[PDB]
Design a binder for this molecule. Structure first.
Ligand SMILES: CC(C)NC[C@H](O)COc1ccc(S(N)(=O)=O)cc1
Ligand SMILES: CC(C)NC[C@H](O)COc1ccc(S(N)(=O)=O)cc1
Ligand SMILES: [Zn+2]
Length: 257
């Protein structure tokens, strides 16, 4: 099926997911001089104090940490959003080299990686219903640059050896995702899509201006994961990012001057 290689990557996806060429696809380049400050945008409310992590999983395209979303334990509100969005999972996209790996870009600049915290609108009852709605999901995107280590990331990095190949999972309870955020919650926002198939146009994107720093040793451990399942020819999980898509009839708004 679909992937990130030459024969199944982003340029092929439209043949099975024709919405790949749609009117509100993600990611996009964020042109900082064209984004407009919107004084009506409220501060984001990230309420992760009661988060309950469950498992960490290599899904063949990234690794993800999943959460109990059966109650309002870890929620995102405010910002551009109406109502309450529950945290379902987080995952990353990264490169083979430090100069590439992010999905969104800022004035064409690519970061080494990008963290996505995926939330769904509780008014739709479950995530499967939410992905069929134009305001069903909210993804909080955070850029990673290489510099000093991120201490809140280390517990993730230390377990990646146990989920090297596609399909492997491990217990990952008591993880606090608040340790993955930067200091500032200043953000850009625009309406978009999932960045992997099915590419559904159901996402309010919230992309933080301030990157987090991670160490070279931390990102190197991302790059030792495998796209393949156990026993298959080893293909390193690197460059699992979709490039920027046409902005079309959309305006990116900034929460800050
Ligand atoms: C070489 C064999 C094992 N791979 C199976 C077959 O080629 C699949 O080829 C493809 C290639 C692209 C896609 S899409 N439009 O989802 O990105 C789906 C199947
Ligand atoms: C039944 C539905 C919810 N399953 C959806 C599927 O797992 C894909 O989910 C996702 C979720 C988030 C993203 S991203 N890179 O835009 O944050 C991509 C795919
Ligand atoms: Zn993602």
């Amino acid at each position: 099926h679909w992937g990130y290689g030459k024969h199944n990557g982003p340029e092929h996806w439209h043949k099975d997911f024709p919405i790949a060429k749609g009117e509100r696809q993600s990611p996009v380049d964020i042109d900082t001089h064209t984004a407009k400050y919107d004084p009506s945008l409220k501060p984001l409310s990230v309420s992760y104090d009661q988060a309950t992590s469950l498992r960490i999983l290599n899904n063949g395209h990234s690794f993800q940490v999943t959460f109990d979303d059966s109650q309002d334990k870890a929620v995102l509100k405010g910002g551009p959003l109406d109502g309450t969005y529950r945290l379902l999972q987080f995952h990353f996209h990264w490169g083979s080299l430090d100069g590439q790996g992010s999905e969104h870009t800022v004035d064409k600049k690519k970061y080494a990686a990008e963290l996505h915290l995926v939330h769904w609108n509780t008014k739709y009852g479950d995530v499967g219903k939410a992905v069929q709605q134009p305001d069903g999901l909210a993804v909080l995107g955070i850029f990673l640059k290489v510099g000093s280590a991120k201490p809140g990331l280390q517990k993730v990095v230390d377990v990646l050896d146990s989920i090297k190949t596609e399909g492997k999972s491990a217990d990952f309870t008591n993880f606090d995702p608040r340790g993955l955020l930067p200091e500032s919650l200043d953000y850009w926002t625009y309406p978009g899509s999932l960045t992997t198939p099915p590419l559904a146009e159901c996402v309010t994107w919230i992309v933080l201006k301030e990157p987090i720093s991670v160490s070279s040793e931390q990102v190197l451990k991302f790059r030792k994961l495998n796209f393949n399942g156990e026993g298959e020819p080893e293909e390193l999980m690197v460059d699992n990012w979709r490039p920027a898509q046409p902005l079309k009839n959309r305006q990116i708004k900034a929460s800050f001057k």
